[PDB]
Amino acid sequence: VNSFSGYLKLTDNVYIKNADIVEEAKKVKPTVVVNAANVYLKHGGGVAGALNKATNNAMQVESDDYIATNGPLKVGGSCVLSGHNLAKHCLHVVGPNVNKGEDIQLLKSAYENFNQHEVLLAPLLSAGIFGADPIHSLRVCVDTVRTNVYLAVFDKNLYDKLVSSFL
Ligand SMILES: O=C(O)C[C@@H]1CCCN(c2ncnc3nc[nH]c23)C1
């Protein structure tokens, strides 16, 4: 038993809810919140901008130090940093950005990072401003992640569509 509430169960291990991941994160304090990061950890908009804003820019400050030491992430890759006031840890995961021409097949590699964590609160990778089809992101998620993932979908219209079209 864990503290996530109001989720619909899609599979043995994948759950979904219409929620703001920032507000969901501040209430659950999950062990891991996933950020929809880019390779530079420049948290300007979308989920990342919103998560970073909720940390009063502390996420960005920590991220800039990470990049200065380690260089950029790979598309499909991840790093674990602090969760600040939102979670114990933040798993920054880089899904392909269709609006940059990145290969959608890397979406599976991106979701594989979730398997290193027993339980996660996450957005749909490559959705939103990253330009992928969220229905496809949810299919790849279900077919790739084996650990317990709680998906927060900000848009109520999208949430209902994802549920109604799920196979
Ligand atoms: O509806 C969804 O979950 C998908 C969208 C796609 C566009 C970017 N996204 C977001 N952008 C800015 N703030 C957000 N807070 C929660 N999600 C946020 C998520």
UniProtKB/Swiss-Prot annotation:
Cite the Macro domain residue spans from the record. Answer: 1-167
Q: What is this protein called?
A: Papain-like protease nsp3
Signal sequence range: none
- In which domain of life is the source organism classified? Viruses
Give a short account of what the protein does: Responsible for the cleavages located at the N-terminus of the replicase polyprotein. Participates together with nsp4 in the assembly of virally-induced cytoplasmic double-membrane vesicles necessary for viral replication. Antagonizes innate immune induction of type I interferon by blocking the phosphorylation, dimerization and subsequent nuclear translocation of host IRF3. Also prevents host NF-kappa-B signaling. In addition, PL-PRO possesses a deubiquitinating/deISGylating activity and processes both 'Lys-48'- and 'Lys-63'-linked polyubiquitin chains from cellular substrates.
Q: Which gene encodes it?
A: rep
Protein species of origin: Severe acute respiratory syndrome coronavirus 2 (2019-nCoV)
* Catalytic activity, reaction form: Thiol-dependent hydrolysis of ester, thioester, amide, peptide and isopeptide bonds formed by the C-terminal Gly of ubiquitin (a 76-residue protein attached to proteins as an intracellular targeting signal)
Full protein stretch here: 1025 to 1191 of 7096
Regarding activators and inhibitors, the annotation says: Inhibited in vitro by GRL-0617.
